[PDB]
TrEMBL record:
Coiled coil: none annotated. It comes from the Bacteria. It comes from Mycobacterium ulcerans (strain Agy99). This is Type I modular polyketide synthase. Residues 23-98 form the Carrier domain.
Amino acid sequence: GAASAATDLAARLNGLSPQQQQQTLATLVAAATATVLGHHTPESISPATAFKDLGIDSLTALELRNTLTHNTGLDLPPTLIFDHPTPHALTQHLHTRLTQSH
């Protein structure tokens, strides 16, 4: 249970530099997509392949969403993949929204 994984996420990021802080999402977000496609590890989830190209099928885009938002504490609608089509993109979103949010 978590009333804010955004304060847990920014906890991984806390103490780190932008690219390092990126990596955490650029690992978790991919871990998320590693889940959606049944790959388990983010090592298979390339950040520049594209969710579309990864197998994200709206359903797994929502399940992506369900994981992302849950790990980052953010509140972005299911069109997150449609707006950010790569693990890098999604990461960029939550890496930027860390400060660009309420």
